[PDB]
Amino acid sequence: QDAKAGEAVFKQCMTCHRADKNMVGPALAGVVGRKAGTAAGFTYSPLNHNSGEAGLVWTADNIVPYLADPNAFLKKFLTEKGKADQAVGVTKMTFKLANEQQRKDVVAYLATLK
Ligand code: HEC
Numbered sequence: 001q002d003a004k005a006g007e008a009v010f011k012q013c014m015t016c017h018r019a020d021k022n023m024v025g026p027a028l029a030g031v032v033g034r035k036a037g038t039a040a041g042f043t044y045s046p047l048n049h050n051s052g053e054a055g056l057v058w059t060a061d062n063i064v065p066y067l068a069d070p071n072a073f074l075k076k077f078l079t080e081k082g083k084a085d086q087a088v089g090v091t092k093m094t095f096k097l098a099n100e101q102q103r104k105d106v107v108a109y110l111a112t113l114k
Pocket residue numbers: 009010012013014015016017024025026031035036037038039043044045046047048049058063067090091092093094095097106
């Protein structure tokens with residue numbers, strides 16, 4: 001949860017994201033504490049959209065495990081809500097980051113965006 005260390009991780013994320021504009025992925029400023037799938041202007045996959053509609057909020061404790069495996073996290077979230085029938089298919093332009101500390105740190109950095 002070292003935000004400054006997270007800034008360096010965020011350079012990897014900038015392959016697809018920016019803070020303040022949509023790119024391959026949605027803009028991330030304000031993502032922490034926000035309903036999943038609700039960045040203005042961005043067309044989400046069914047899986048990413050349905051997860052937010054089912055009540056997924058991007059708290060730090062949700063973002064960190066998500067970053068290791070977006071598809072598996074979102075499917076598990078929906079399945080535990082009794083909504084496996086909304087979990088069919090996969091996300092867009094999928095990226096995984098294995099390193100846990102890097103995930104924790106970048107998530108602290110995301111909170112600094114707003
Ligand atoms: C392109 C290969 C990506 C890289 C590198 C990273 N992300 Fe990403 N992310 C990408 C897309 C195309 C999407 C939307 C997928 C969909 O199916 O609609 C996302 C989504 C996120 C989210 C969820 C945002 C929301 O619900 O509003 C988060 C929190 C996120 N991405 C974070 C993130 C970080 C921190 C990354 C670096 C470790 C990162 N992503 C890389 C595409 C890509």
